[PDB]
Symmetry: C2
């Protein structure tokens, strides 16, 4: 209700959605593995602990984002992630 | 791999995960006021939002905003006031 749990990829990605006055954000964990996700709205992912190695439509090569780094994903798109250690992240909509 | 825990009638939820340095958690606290106990000392980092806390050593409530971190003594307890839903990272100290 207040905090929405989502489970993806047979339990290898889990997230908690929460709302502030400007709307919803999510914090989640990805277990080691390789995943694909689609986007609706563009979004900003911040690595909280661990690292995400990603390939978006604009990336000629895979790019590793470590803790404290943030990347954006285009709207209505998709991207791949490689996870070598269980990694926590924050996911937000872009400012309007 | 990823252990979900739920507390306080759904007002606190956490996801526990292990790296080579051991276990860490990320979680969310919905607006409200909570008391938590500790075993090992803990380091809590505010990911988004803010936590206003009172530990045994705090004469007054202390507010930590996004990016800021605080430590809680081992084998202790502390109170939190949450005014907006707040995400946090919780780690062991050593």
């Amino acid at each position: 209700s207040m905090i929405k749990e989502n489970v993806y990829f047979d339990g290898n990605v889990k997230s908690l959605g929460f709302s502030q006055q400007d709307g919803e954000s999510t914090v989640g964990v990805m277990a080691p593995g390789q995943y694909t996700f689609g986007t609706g709205a563009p979004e900003r992912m911040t690595v909280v602990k661990g690292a995400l190695t990603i390939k978006r439509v604009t990336d000629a090569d895979w790019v590793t984002f470590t803790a404290g780094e943030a990347f954006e994903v285009a709207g209505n798109s998709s991207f791949d992630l490689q996870v070598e250690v269980a990694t926590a992240y924050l996911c937000e909509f872009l400012p309007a």
